[PDB]
Design an enzyme around this catalytic site. Structure first.
Site, PDB file in Angstrom:
ATOM      1  N   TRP A 218      86.262  -0.108  -1.312  1.00 36.31           N
ATOM      2  CA  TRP A 218      87.282  -1.129  -1.071  1.00 36.31           C
ATOM      3  C   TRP A 218      87.098  -2.298  -2.040  1.00 36.31           C
ATOM      4  O   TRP A 218      88.046  -2.735  -2.693  1.00 36.31           O
ATOM      5  CB  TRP A 218      87.196  -1.680   0.355  1.00 36.31           C
ATOM      6  N   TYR A 222      89.679  -3.438  -4.857  1.00 39.02           N
ATOM      7  CA  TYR A 222      90.243  -4.776  -4.783  1.00 39.02           C
ATOM      8  C   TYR A 222      89.828  -5.591  -6.000  1.00 39.02           C
ATOM      9  O   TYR A 222      90.636  -6.344  -6.550  1.00 39.02           O
ATOM     10  CB  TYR A 222      89.804  -5.496  -3.498  1.00 39.02           C
ATOM     11  N   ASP A 238      92.045  -0.414   2.931  1.00 37.05           N
ATOM     12  CA  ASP A 238      92.336  -1.758   3.393  1.00 37.05           C
ATOM     13  C   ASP A 238      92.674  -1.805   4.870  1.00 37.05           C
ATOM     14  O   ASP A 238      93.305  -0.895   5.407  1.00 37.05           O
ATOM     15  CB  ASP A 238      93.483  -2.365   2.605  1.00 37.05           C
TER      16      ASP A 238
END
Lengths: 282, 282, 282, 282
Positions: A218, A222, A238
């Site tokens: 993640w 990101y 997410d």
DNA sequence: GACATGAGTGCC
DNA sequence: GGCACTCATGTC
DNA sequence: GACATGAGTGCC
DNA sequence: GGCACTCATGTC
């Protein structure tokens, strides 16, 4: 003072609102007509103030005297933050319906990859507002104040955080593990091991990024999206995204998101900001 | 038609001269009143033209339309190439006599670290004019030609040289080992292992570069100097440098050079371009 | 009780003398007619007594009841320590004069590779007498005491030293770097990374040992000779060897020693124990 | 000639039965009253013969002339293969009813870990009988035949199997990955990377082994059990073991086996040779 | 959200 | 029976 | 100039 | 002795 162009449309309220929600106290100042923040480029320091001009589809940038020697780099960082490169016609004509509602949508980038890396980590698990809170306490304790602008403080530099006590960061409100992840990152930054600009093989780099302690898929995704302004990445892990694809698993959301290639980052943003979106009733 | 500032004095004649000798055919065009070259930023491509304005201590930059979308980064690239951030009264106020003859000296950067790495490599052992012709053949075989400006050609990309046949590169006029150094470097660039910007710990980074196949200390030092525009590195292993410090070993040269810290890179440029220079009895 | 035979001649006075100088208080006991020490094989523990019967060129081995369930193992460990497999006719034959003043010369092995590993490291720099004393201190602090033999103590195991406090070992009179070397060797032994038996490729194996912190070429060579009882290794780096080959560098000495292949370990011993010896100025 | 002790009871029929089923032609002979095989210890070769003497709880070992110089190690190799160290009261005291039916059960080990590694690998996904013939083919093609006992061939050395053509091995009747696995294991043995004796941290050493090509969790376990004679390992990934625990998944069996610590290896053997065996329905 | 553990599901 | 690619668990 | 060897030097 | 750094020296 300085001036940069952009191609219409550009939803400046959406962008400013997005930055405002994550804004860090003493570091940035966000208003409805402008954005301003501290900025360090090497040993050069100052305040940057970005003022959009809608009618003229231009962005005016002002720099405090200490940033003048590296003006062009500041401008470059600003254009990455605001995604001035985007051609909405290309993206919207690709995403079709998904983007028709906010055609001025842009990808909020960063002014510095290390900072974004710190932001991403501290954004783990918690709420957006809670991360800004946490990031604010880290800047306060490790950042440097501007002699010329005391109200402002520079984001903690790589060396400063690399030489921080894990216990101290922990005391700010994060697990020991998170604090260790931050220190490791500052070092990677000092050694040049954290890509600072977008790499040619984003997929490969994100894999290497995941070998970092505290950085899972993640965070790597990101970070790629914001820290590198990688335009074709989705965040199937997410929290909010799982809430938009009810009952679907990571590899499903992922396989689904493939229809938005090569603008998955933009599709991701639209979904986050489409209140009642839901996969096609197919 | 953008514009960037610089502090006087600035020896343009000397700078353009340094770039002119190394100019790569079809990529760069150097004249006594302007510099111009193809330029790629992501998928955006075009031609940059840099015209110095001695009258107003300014540098006028013009970009073709295909680069306008990423205008800011282009200006940043030109400012690193021309060392616009330099405050000569600070460097010379520190170097003293060594810099008094050519106070307008600047450190010639690069427009892209990957390219600079390739040039550093293709510049080993051979003559300056040779590396230039050699590099032009490489840009000839792997470069992206500009539709907007047929006369120009973009410098090879990491993905294009990473997928290159060793033998093919060799057939252009270099040992196989060097063709392999280029291929490895491109790979490193692709996955983010090659720092594209000056890292916090310049020598930790340089040490890591020395593990790369085809890269020894001289190449690392030179890469850091031009690729990162590192301001405090010396090249004690340099052919000419050894001639400037008659009968002195690398360590002795490096020991001596400490007197110019923290501006050893400038010291290096002045000593390189000062025929007959010789160290004191100190 | 048990008996192992050997091929004459065997110089027991030399063997016991060599072991006697390096004996570790509370661990070993060496007299004129016998050798005895603590011995652990897994969780089996006890005392081993070896009495050499010259008349019948045999070796009498007695085992405390605690080691009886692993008798063979103890026997094999004694045979490796005393080089009972050696055919003096073959070595003394392939060595000529060098090995004529003492054809009973045997390569002193070890009873456990890790122990020898520890001895080798602790035997660095200091004198044989100091090494034994230093080793005695380590056994005294981390060793295992035998309930049936309060006077004896088992040599420390890898499980204890791996858990040891660097500072604790440093306090025994050794540099911090040497204590860390021990801790790392113990971790290697626990992990199965330390060859406990002579490998097929001694050169490769030693090169791998040299990557261990605290272990250089000397220690690796000496460990191979004693720890694996490798019969064809020389110590071109040894102190006493340097005095035995005045004016010659490690590589010259090493080129010279090639003449005694494949019995260099033995030659090394003879030259070691011949004060007068000196090379043939070819 | 030589005699080794063991503590009763000792189920010799079972033991010889286990070894006979896995006997490799030209390598070992197994009969009702004895066991015999070729043996290589360095450059010494010959035939070892083991004859149990039930009357006195002893095993008689006879060595052909070529192995006398290293008799003790041969004796030790036999003690590890026949598990002479075992104290059946302790094991059976702990195992409870599980081993009440066959208190003489022993852990069949090996005379060399490398060889055992090869047997573990060659016995993957095949029947005991096929593995034996497959192995025998390998032995014949790369072994060292005894001049004094023509029908006996020494098991292939690591050096010999490292330089084997990855195809000739396929020929004999094994996949391509199967032969690479043998050639890999062999190099490890040459370099000392394959532990030849039981490590202090078995779980850890097994992990490392699993990074070996062709070596998975099953082979690593079976290898620890037989090649190192580790006494507390279980094989939940074993086909037969799966049938003995109807339904249950690898992790569940494992959790159930825990009740037999620290003798899971014996528990394993008993379950393997107890047909209608099924866990407590508790 | 990171991370080590654990169940499975086809192809060699 | 190795081995690669997912999901489900369960502290931190 | 990259890069193996080899041998020195000096600080743990 | 280990080890990082340093200075030939020969090759590609």
């Amino acid at each position: 003072m300085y001036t940069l162009n952009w191609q219409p449309p550009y939803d400046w309220s959406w962008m400013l609102g997005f930055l405002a929600a994550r804004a860090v106290s003493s570091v940035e100042t966000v208003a409805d007509s402008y954005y301003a923040r501290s900025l360090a480029v090497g040993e050069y320091r100052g305040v940057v103030t970005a003022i959009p001009d809608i009618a003229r589809h231009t962005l005016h940038i002002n720099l405090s005297a200490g940033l003048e020697p590296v003006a062009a780099e500041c401008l470059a960082k600003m254009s990455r933050l605001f995604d001035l490169q985007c051609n909405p016609q290309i993206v919207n004509g690709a995403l079709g319906r998904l983007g028709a509602a906010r055609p001025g949508l842009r990808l909020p980038g960063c002014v510095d990859a290390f900072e974004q890396g710190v932001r991403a980590i501290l954004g783990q698990l918690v709420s957006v507002a809670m991360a800004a809170k946490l990031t604010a306490r880290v800047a306060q304790l490790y950042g440097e104040r501007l002699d010329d602008f005391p109200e402002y403080i520079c984001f903690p530099t790589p060396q400063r955080l690399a030489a921080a006590d894990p216990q101290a960061l922990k005391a700010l409100g994060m697990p020991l593990k998170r604090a260790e992840a931050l220190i490791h990152l500052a070092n990677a930054a000092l050694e040049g091991t954290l890509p600072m600009t977008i790499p040619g093989d984003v997929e490969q780099a994100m894999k290497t990024l995941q070998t970092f302690p505290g950085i899972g898929r993640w965070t790597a995704n990101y970070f790629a999206l914001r820290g590198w302004q990688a335009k074709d990445v989705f965040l199937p892990d997410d929290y909010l995204i799982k809430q938009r694809f009810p009952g679907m698993t990571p590899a499903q959301i992922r396989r689904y998101a493939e229809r938005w290639k090569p603008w998955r980052s933009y599709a991701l943003l639209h979904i986050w900001y489409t209140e009642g979106w839901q996969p096609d009733e197919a």
